[PDB]
Amino acid sequence: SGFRKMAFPSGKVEGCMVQVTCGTTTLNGLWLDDVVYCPRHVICTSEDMLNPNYEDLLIRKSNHNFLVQAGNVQLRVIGHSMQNCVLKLKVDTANPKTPKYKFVRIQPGQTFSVLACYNGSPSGVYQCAMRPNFTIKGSFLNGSCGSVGFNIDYDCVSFCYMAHMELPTGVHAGTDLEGNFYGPFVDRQTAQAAGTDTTITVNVLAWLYAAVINGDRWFLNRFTTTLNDFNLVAMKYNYEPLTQDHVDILGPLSAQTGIAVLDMCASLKELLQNGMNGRTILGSALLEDEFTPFDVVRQCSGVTF
Amino acid sequence: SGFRKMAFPSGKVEGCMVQVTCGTTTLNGLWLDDVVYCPRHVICTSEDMLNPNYEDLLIRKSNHNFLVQAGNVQLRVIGHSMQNCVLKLKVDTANPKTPKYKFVRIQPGQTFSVLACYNGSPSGVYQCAMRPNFTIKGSFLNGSCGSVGFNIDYDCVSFCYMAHMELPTGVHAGTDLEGNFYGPFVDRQTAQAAGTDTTITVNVLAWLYAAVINGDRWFLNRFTTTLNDFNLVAMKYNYEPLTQDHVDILGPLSAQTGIAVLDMCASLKELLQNGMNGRTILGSALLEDEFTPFDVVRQCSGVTF
Ligand SMILES: *[C@H](O)[C@H](C[C@@H]1CCNC1=O)NC(=O)[C@H](CC(C)C)NC(=O)OCc1ccccc1
Numbered sequence: 001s002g003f004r005k006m007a008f009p010s011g012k013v014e015g016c017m018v019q020v021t022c023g024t025t026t027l028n029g030l031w032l033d034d035v036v037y038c039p040r041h042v043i044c045t046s047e048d049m050l051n052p053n054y055e056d057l058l059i060r061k062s063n064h065n066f067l068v069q070a071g072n073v074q075l076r077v078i079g080h081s082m083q084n085c086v087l088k089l090k091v092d093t094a095n096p097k098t099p100k101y102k103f104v105r106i107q108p109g110q111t112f113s114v115l116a117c118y119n120g121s122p123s124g125v126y127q128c129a130m131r132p133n134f135t136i137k138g139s140f141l142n143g144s145c146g147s148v149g150f151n152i153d154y155d156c157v158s159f160c161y162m163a164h165m166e167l168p169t170g171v172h173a174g175t176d177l178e179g180n181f182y183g184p185f186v187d188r189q190t191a192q193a194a195g196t197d198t199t200i201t202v203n204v205l206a207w208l209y210a211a212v213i214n215g216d217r218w219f220l221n222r223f224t225t226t227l228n229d230f231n232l233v234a235m236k237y238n239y240e241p242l243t244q245d246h247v248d249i250l251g252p253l254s255a256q257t258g259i260a261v262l263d264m265c266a267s268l269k270e271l272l273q274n275g276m277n278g279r280t281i282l283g284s285a286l287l288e289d290e291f292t293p294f295d296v297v298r299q300c301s302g303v304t305f
Numbered sequence: 306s307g308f309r310k311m312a313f314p315s316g317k318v319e320g321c322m323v324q325v326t327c328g329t330t331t332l333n334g335l336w337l338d339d340v341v342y343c344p345r346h347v348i349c350t351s352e353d354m355l356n357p358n359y360e361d362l363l364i365r366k367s368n369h370n371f372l373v374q375a376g377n378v379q380l381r382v383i384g385h386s387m388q389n390c391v392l393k394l395k396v397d398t399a400n401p402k403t404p405k406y407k408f409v410r411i412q413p414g415q416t417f418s419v420l421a422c423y424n425g426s427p428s429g430v431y432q433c434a435m436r437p438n439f440t441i442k443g444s445f446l447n448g449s450c451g452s453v454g455f456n457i458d459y460d461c462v463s464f465c466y467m468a469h470m471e472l473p474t475g476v477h478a479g480t481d482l483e484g485n486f487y488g489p490f491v492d493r494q495t496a497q498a499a500g501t502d503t504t505i506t507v508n509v510l511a512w513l514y515a516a517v518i519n520g521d522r523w524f525l526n527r528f529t530t531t532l533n534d535f536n537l538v539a540m541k542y543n544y545e546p547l548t549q550d551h552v553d554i555l556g557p558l559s560a561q562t563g564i565a566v567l568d569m570c571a572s573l574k575e576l577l578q579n580g581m582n583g584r585t586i587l588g589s590a591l592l593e594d595e596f597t598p599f600d601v602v603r604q605c606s607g608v609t610f
């Protein structure tokens with residue numbers, strides 16, 4: 001029993017992290033096959049970040065201006081190109097630790113593990129979720145750019161995120177591994193505000209099912225509700241509108257616990273209207289929304305990789 | 306910026322996890338050099354667990370009754386011995402992935418990362434802390450025994466925990482890697498109650514310093530207090546008594562934030578007496594006590610391994 005915020009084993013990703021230096025700027029890169037992926041602002045100085053013209057900045061950059069280092073061994077850069085906001089550095093040696101991998105762009109509400117790195121060296125691993133405003137609540141200091149988020153399917157590593165920047169509200173933003181930012185953000189040292197921090201309703205419900213599985217059941221009320229009525233109460237507390245697809249996804253957890261999805265929505269509705277009265281649910285005094293229905297099933301079943 | 310519950314990279318430990326089968330029972334083991342460490346109750350059946358006599362049960366167990374499997378390759382068992390509550394299986398092949406390692410028994414209040422495994426395969430990684438009642442709040446299903454907790458010092462993996470059992474209150478208990486249980490617990494299928502769940506006061510204070518570093522500062526009051534006066538209020542809320550050593554350990558964080566330790570204690574005292582008024586601190590509606598002063602410094606500085 002027990003339920004914990006759990007990240008994937010980071011071993012397969014640690015073997016792909018390198019250090020990319022371009023002048024004064026040093027950040028992390030991802031060495032897959034004979035390609036190194038890193039944020040394109042590695043070519044910016046302490047002044048160009050306000051309004052960088054990456055096409056012009058890349059003109060006076062040659063293959064030899066990129067220092068790619070894996071541990072204490074250097075990789076020879078034989079080619080480079082800019083794909084959106086990521087830089088692809090063609091090296092001459094294929095990474096011997098390259099695992100089976102995919103490039104996947106995730107949707108808001110999906111979760112992934114982040115391997116925070118500095119100078120091409122892993123610092124730690126923690127679980128995240130793509131917010132509805134396309135940001136992530138992470139832990140990133142200077143030099144952490146290039147750290148990647150990933151999911152693991154058995155033996156296939158699914159790369160979905162790369163850290164690029166922090167927003168003025170202490171929240172972070174990045175791109176997928178094809179260089180396209182999540183959301184309306186740009187790799188620019190400007191004032192970019194994020195939208196309203198919406199709560200992932202289907203994830204709260206899946207987390208409530210996890211609590212029922214693990215003994216926490218005081219919040220189970222004697223009420224039920226409808227989808228439209230719940231969404232009227234959810235829209236005032238900045239909750240994602242619940243859809244019929246979300247109900248279907250919660251199907252497995254509903255059948256396993258004998259508690260209908262709409263009955264669980266009524267329990268959430270009361271927790272939103274009455275609070276938690278100082279009580280806790282799975283050791284949390286607040287409603288957690290960073291477990292997908294899939295994370296709950298995986299953790300409660302013992303799925304390995 | 307940002308502060309997250311962060312576990313060490315699990316890569317160095319994934320390469321040491323094996324599957325140990327003894328009859329019907331299957332659990333995980335730790336392959337270091339030519340030794341495999343696993344809980345001794347791998348030799349118990351579904352009935353002996355109530356009152357096992359491990360000396361007698363081990364008499365009719367031979368080297369060949371232990372099936373150690375690393376992936377799809379088997380290790381030949383050439384010797385076995387019982388050291389307290391762990392079994393040491395002498396194999397003929399040294400693990401080629403053995404990292405620099407230590408066997409360290411940690412104290413209550415220290416933190417470590419757990420690599421939850423099933424059938425010798427890693428499932429996930431999460432950060433824990435040794436509770437003052439010598440339990441841990443983890444996520445363990447059937448077949449997870451043998452999973453280990455660890456800290457990493459640069460390139461040295463410090464092994465400190467091995468999962469053995471769950472207590473009737475959904476909390477977990479285990480031993481160090483020399484077989485000695487943490488606390489008064491025994492590897493027995495009996496009713497073993499845990500003590501009062503005390504909060505690690507020095508860890509709450511270190512976490513409050515982290516909040517001040519990361520912008521959360523509404524809880525900073527205009528008060529101060531003394532050590533004795535704080536402990537009078539802390540003993541009623543089941544908080545660990547604060548000592549002068551704890552003050553010294555918080556020295557680095559105090560000097561970095563310009564906030565004296567006793568001033569921070571006064572802010573905690575008010576949070577204990579008045580609550581958090583529905584507000585949050587680093588995204589938590591409850592006081593977190595699973596960050597040591599060292600975890601805070603490490604995460605806020607960018608220490609790599
Ligand atoms: C990359 O290492 C670095 C990581 C930041 C710094 C601390 N946490 C992070 O996520 N990011 C940058 O250097 C980036 C440069 C590009 C925008 C070209 N700028 C940045 O992220 O600064 C943070 C910030 C930006 C705008 C307003 C307030 C803060």
Ligand SMILES: *[C@H](O)[C@H](C[C@@H]1CCNC1=O)NC(=O)[C@H](CC(C)C)NC(=O)OCc1ccccc1
Nearest residue numbers: 001346445446447448449450470471473492493
């Ligand atoms: C080892 O795989 C297993 C892990 C338990 C089961 C789910 N979470 C855990 O931590 N532990 C055992 O099989 C163990 C056997 C030894 C005590 C010989 N027994 C156990 O942990 O059962 C849990 C329990 C014990 C006593 C009261 C209530 C529950």
